[PDB]
Write a protein that binds this DNA or RNA. Structure first.
Lengths: 82, 205, 85, 70
RNA sequence: AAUUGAAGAGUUUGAUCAUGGCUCAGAUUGAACGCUGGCGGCAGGCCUAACACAUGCAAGUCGAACGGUAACAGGAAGAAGCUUGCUUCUUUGCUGACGAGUGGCGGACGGGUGAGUAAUGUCUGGGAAACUGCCUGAUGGAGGGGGAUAACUACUGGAAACGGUAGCUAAUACCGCAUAACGUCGCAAGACCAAAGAGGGGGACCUUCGGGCCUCUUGCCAUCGGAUGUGCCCAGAUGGGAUUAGCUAGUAGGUGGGGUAACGGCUCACCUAGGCGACGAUCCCUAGCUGGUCUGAGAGGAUGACCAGCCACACUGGAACUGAGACACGGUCCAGACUCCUACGGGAGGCAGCAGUGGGGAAUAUUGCACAAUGGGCGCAAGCCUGAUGCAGCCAUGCCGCGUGUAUGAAGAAGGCCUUCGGGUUGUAAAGUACUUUCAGCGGGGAGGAAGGGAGUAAAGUUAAUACCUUUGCUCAUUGACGUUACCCGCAGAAGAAGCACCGGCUAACUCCGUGCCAGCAGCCGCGGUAAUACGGAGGGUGCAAGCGUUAAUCGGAAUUACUGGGCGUAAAGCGCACGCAGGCGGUUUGUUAAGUCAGAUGUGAAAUCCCCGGGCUCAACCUGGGAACUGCAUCUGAUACUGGCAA
C-alpha cells in the first residue's frame, strides 16, 4: 500500500508542506517517488499557496494509492469537480 | 554596528567632505580641514598602492553607513549581475532606507535621517517600515507616520536640501512629507568624485 | 522480556510445537515415498505418493510450504519412479 | 563571591538516605542541588540576583606541614 | 536569463639574475582557548572510549471476536433512613465500558552509532531464474461437524521471580469429510487442495419467544494481474603498499540426488586437472558509500558533521524458530564478560532510543513540554499510543541584522599629551541647548498555523424499507503545546547596552618615556650595546565590532608530481654500456566489418543542493515556485578521414 499523504518543510513556526507519494512506513520527510504539487498553510493570496496536479491523483489511485485525510481535504478545497 | 564617535576626524583623515557633520551652518570653521588627524601626523604620508584603495574605501563606507561585514556580500551577488560591476554594486548601495531619506531632505545628516528611520517614523508603499538594510525597490513611494511628522527638527533640514539640486531619479513632495522612487541611479547621476575603481581592485584579489 | 507483547514469546513456542509437528508430519510422508523408491515397484511408491499428495498440499494450504517446494517434490518423485521406466 | 552565573539540575532531600525528588524550594528547608561546577565551600549565592548578605567565615588554620609521596 | 572568470609580496648575496624550499595576504570551520559582552530571527550543537551505565520514559491496540466483569457508572428483581417512592441494600452482567487471559494485527516502521568490510557492499547502467502482508481491480465460493485449551475453581510450592497438577468451557484459535476451477503435478490420463463469522436496523411471516427471515456495513477464502516493498546475477569504476610473488583443495568444471520462494559447488557422490595473477593475484594497513559539501579559472584536490537514499550493526559469539518479511535495537535458547535483588535455595539484564551519570577529553545541551500540526500502528469510528516529531530550555559556535542616540555646539574648556617651550593637539569631542527613545523596561488590544471530528435537518443512492449505513452542502457548540506569541497603539527618560587585535617592512596606523644582547619580541627577515617608530606603559591614530584575536585542519596562491600545465651540460635529475622476450608506438597502396572516434533519437542521471528569473518572511539570512543543471552512462540506427583488426 503505497499512499498519497503529506510531508513537511518550511521553518520554525511557519510550515510549508510538500505532498508526495510513498509507502506508509517510509520516514515522513524521506523516501518517495514523485511529488505532485505542494501546500502552504500561510497561503498568502498574492500568487499561489496550494497547488495540486490532479491527473496523477486520478492515476495513482488507478494503482490503488489510499489517500490521507489532509490530501483528501485538499481535494475538497481545490474544488476538484468545478 | 555604528561608529557613534567623533565623526569629523573621519572627514579630516580622509579630506573629502562626505556629508557627515552637515547641520545647518554648512561651513565648518572649527576643524582645520586638510591637516593631520591627531598629535603626531604632521608629515604627509606616502600613500602606497594598498592604502590608496583603503583610503577611498573609507569614503564609500561612510556616506551610506555600510560596514565591512555588509559591504563584502554586496560585491558577491554583484559579480553575477551583468555589465558594469561598479554600476551593479552601486545598484545595491542606492536602495538603502538611510540613502533615500537622505536624498529626500528628511534629516540634516545620515544619522539624524537614521534616527527617523530607527524610530519607526517611515511608511513605505503601505507597510510601516523597519530595519535600515531594506533595499527600496522601484515603483514605491515613501511616507512618514502621522505621530512623528513635523516634530521641531524636520523643518530646517528640509531647507538646506531644497537648495540642493534634487537629483532627478527620485522626486520629493516635502509639503506633506512624502516622496517617490522611480528607478536606479546610474554613473551619470552621482558626484563622480568618488573613484569606484580602487574598490574592485581590493575584491579582485 | 520487558514489553507488554511478551506473550508473543509465549505464543511462539506455543505455535512452533504445532508447526514443527506438521513439519514432522509432512516430512515422514515425503520420507515414506523414499522408503519404496529403492525396492523396485513403480506403484508401491505411487500408492504412498498419494499419501503425502494431500498432506504436502494441505500444508502448503495451511500455510507452511510456499507452494513451490510442493511443486518441486511432486515433480522429482514422479520422475523418480519413471526414471527406471 | 566568584562573579559567575551558574544554573540548577535539581534539589534533593533525603528521608533515610532516600533521594525522593522535589522541585519546590521552601524557605526554611535544606536542599542538595546537583551538578553545579565551581561551587566552593563558603559561597554566598543569590537566586533573584539581589545584593548578598555577605558571609566570610573560613577561619581555622591547619597545624601540620607534612609532605606526600604518591 | 541560467560557467563574465586565473594578480601577488617578503625571504639566500655587497648587489643582480636564475633555481628552489620557507612564509604571508583569500576563503571555510561540526570548533576550541583567552578578553569582553545588549537584543531579534535562522540553523547547528559527544567528533575522544562501538567506554562502563543508576533513574524515568521511548509500541501499543481492537469488546463492531469471545468466554468473562476484576474496578467504575447506571439500570433492574427486590427493597426504606420510616423527609408515604427525597432512597439504605444484597443480588443480574440487561447495558455502558472493560484490569486480567485466549485471539486477529503490529512488534523488521521510525529512531540511534560508524566498529567491521576493499568487496556477498555502494554507485551507475543492464538484467532473469522469484515472492509480495497491508493496498486495489475483476472472477468463483463462503455447506455441514468435532476434539483440546488458557482464563476461571479445588489443593498448593517459592524470599521473590516464577510456577505446579486433576478438571471444565467459548472464540475470526486449532484440526476434519464434502466440494472445487481459467490453481497445482504430469506427454497424455487423471490425481488433490479453501474458509468464518461478528455488528446495525427492520415489515409480514415466525415465535422453541437466543431469533430464524430480508438487507446494508464490515469480514474471510481460492486465483489471474497491477502498484509495490525485496531477494539474486553481470559489466565498469570504487584506496595506499611490490621493502606483499606466487595463491587455491569445494578449490575451477561435468554428470546425478538434494537444496531455497528463486538461479548456482548452495551441498554430498564420482570423474577431469585445472582456476586467478606482473592489464597488481593473494597478503597487509586504513576506511562505510553515494547524491553532495569546501576550495578552485578550469582540470583537479581534501572531505562525506546537519540533510535524503543504500549498507552494516544491536555488549561479545552462534544457531534456529515465528511471521508477508528477521537469522529480530527495547524477541528465544546456549555461552562468555561485567554488574544488580537475596530471607543466601536461587534470580535477572542490555541507553551505538530521548534526557542524563562518572570517567575519557582542547571540546559540545533540559534528569524539559504537548500530542494542536504532519506521519505511523491498531480499530468501524470516537479514541488510545506517539521522546517519530511540533515546540520549548542552555550555547556571540556559526550564518544575517537591530540598537548602543541625534542636530546644533569655539572660549577652539579642564585634564592629558608633545613641543623652535611661541604653539599645536585630543576635540564638535565633552559640557551646554533643542528633539526623540526602535528594542528596552512596562501596560494593554490582538491574525494565522484549524484542516477536521462530533451534534441536528433535508436531499441523492441501496433495499421490502420513508430504517440503517454512505454521501452532499447547511445549521450548532467547541479543539492551540507554543503564548506575558508574531504584531499595533500608549507611557517617563537617552536613561540599561563598546569593546578586542594592531602601529619596522610585508600590511593602513607615532614621538617620547622606562629598561640597556638584561627582562623581553615574533607569522616571516630579524630588533634590544645605557645614545629604541620592532620591548613595557601612557597618549596619538588604525582595522573591526557584540564580537575580536590566537590555535588546529582542507584547498588556494603552489606552473611546489606541471594530462590541462614542469625539467634533467653546470643548479636535485640520462641507468657504466650494449642485447633483448613482455610492453609502447609505427612508412605506403586497394578492398572490408565498423571495434576507436563522430552525429542524431530514446530512456536513465531520485528530491534537496550550486546557478537563472520571481513569490513569501517588512528587508537580509532563511524558506520555496517554475526552469536550467546534472558536464555522465547504456542502447538503437547511421558516416569511413585518420587509427586498430582483417585480407592482398
Amino acid at each position: 500500500m503505497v499512499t498519497i499523504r503529506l510531508a513537511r518543510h518550511g521553518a520554525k513556526k511557519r510550515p510549508f508542506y510538500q505532498v508526495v507519494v510513498a509507502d506508509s512506513r517510509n520516514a515522513r520527510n524521506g523516501r518517495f517517488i514523485e511529488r505532485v504539487g505542494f501546500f502552504n498553510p500561510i497561503a498568502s493570496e498574492k500568487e499561489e499557496g496550494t497547488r495540486l496536479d490532479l491527473d496523477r491523483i486520478a492515476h495513482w489511485v488507478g494503482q490503488g494509492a489510499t489517500i490521507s485525510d489532509r490530501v483528501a481535504a485538499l481535494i475538497k478545497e481545490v474544488n476538484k469537480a468545478a | 554596528a555604528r561608529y557613534l564617535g567623533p565623526k569629523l576626524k573621519l572627514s579630516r583623515r580622509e579630506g573629502t567632505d562626505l556629508f557627515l557633520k552637515s547641520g545647518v551652518r554648512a561651513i565648518d570653521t572649527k576643524c582645520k580641514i586638510e591637516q593631520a588627524p591627531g598629535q603626531h601626523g604632521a608629515r604627509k604620508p606616502r600613500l602606497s598602492d594598498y592604502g590608496v584603495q583603503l583610503r577611498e574605501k573609507q569614503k564609500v563606507r561612510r556616506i551610506y553607513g555600510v560596514l565591512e561585514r555588509q559591504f563584502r556580500n554586496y560585491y558577491k551577488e554583484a559579480a553575477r549581475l551583468k555589465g558594469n560591476t561598479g554600476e551593479n554594486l552601486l545598484a545595491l548601495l542606492e536602495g538603502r532606507l538611510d540613502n533615500v531619506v537622505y536624498r529626500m531632505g528628511f534629516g540634516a545628516t545620515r544619522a539624524e535621517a537614521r534616527q527617523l528611520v530607527s524610530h519607526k517614523a517611515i511608511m513605505v508603499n503601505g507597510r510601516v517600515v523597519n530595519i535600515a538594510s531594506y533595499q527600496v525597490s522601484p515603483n514605491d513611494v515613501v511616507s512618514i507616520r502621522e505621530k512623528a511628522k513635523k516634530q521641531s527638527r524636520v523643518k530646517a533640514a528640509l531647507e538646506l536640501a531644497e537648495q540642493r539640486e534634487k537629483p532627478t531619479w527620485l522626486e520629493v513632495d516635502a509639503g506633506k512629507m512624502e516622496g517617490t522612487f522611480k528607478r536606479k541611479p546610474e554613473r551619470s547621476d552621482l558626484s563622480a568624485d568618488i573613484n569606484e575603481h580602487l574598490i574592485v581592485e581590493l575584491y579582485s584579489k | 522480556n520487558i514489553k507488554s507483547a511478551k506473550k508473543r514469546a509465549i505464543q511462539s513456542e506455543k505455535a512452533r510445537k504445532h508447526n514443527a509437528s506438521r513439519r514432522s508430519m509432512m516430512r515422514t510422508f515425503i520420507k515414506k515415498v523414499y522408503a519404496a523408491i529403492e525396492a523396485g515397484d513403480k506403484a508401491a511408491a505411487q500408492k504412498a505418493f498419494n499419501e503425502m499428495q494431500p498432506i504436502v498440499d494441505r500444508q502448503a494450504a495451511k500455510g507452511l510450504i510456499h507452494k513451490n517446494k510442493a511443486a518441486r517434490h511432486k515433480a522429482n518423485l514422479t520422475a523418480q519412479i519413471n526414471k527406471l521406466a | 563571591v566568584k562573579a559567575a552565573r551558574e544554573r540548577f539540575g535539581r534539589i534533593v532531600q533525603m528521608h533515610a538516605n532516600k533521594r525522593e525528588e522535589i522541585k519546590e524550594v521552601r524557605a526554611g528547608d535544606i536542599a542538595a542541588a546537583i551538578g553545579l561546577k565551581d561551587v566552593t565551600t563558603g559561597d554566598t549565592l543569590c537566586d533573584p540576583d539581589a545584593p548578598i548578605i555577605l558571609e566570610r567565615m573560613e577561619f581555622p588554620e591547619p597545624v601540620i606541614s607534612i609532605a606526600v609521596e604518591p
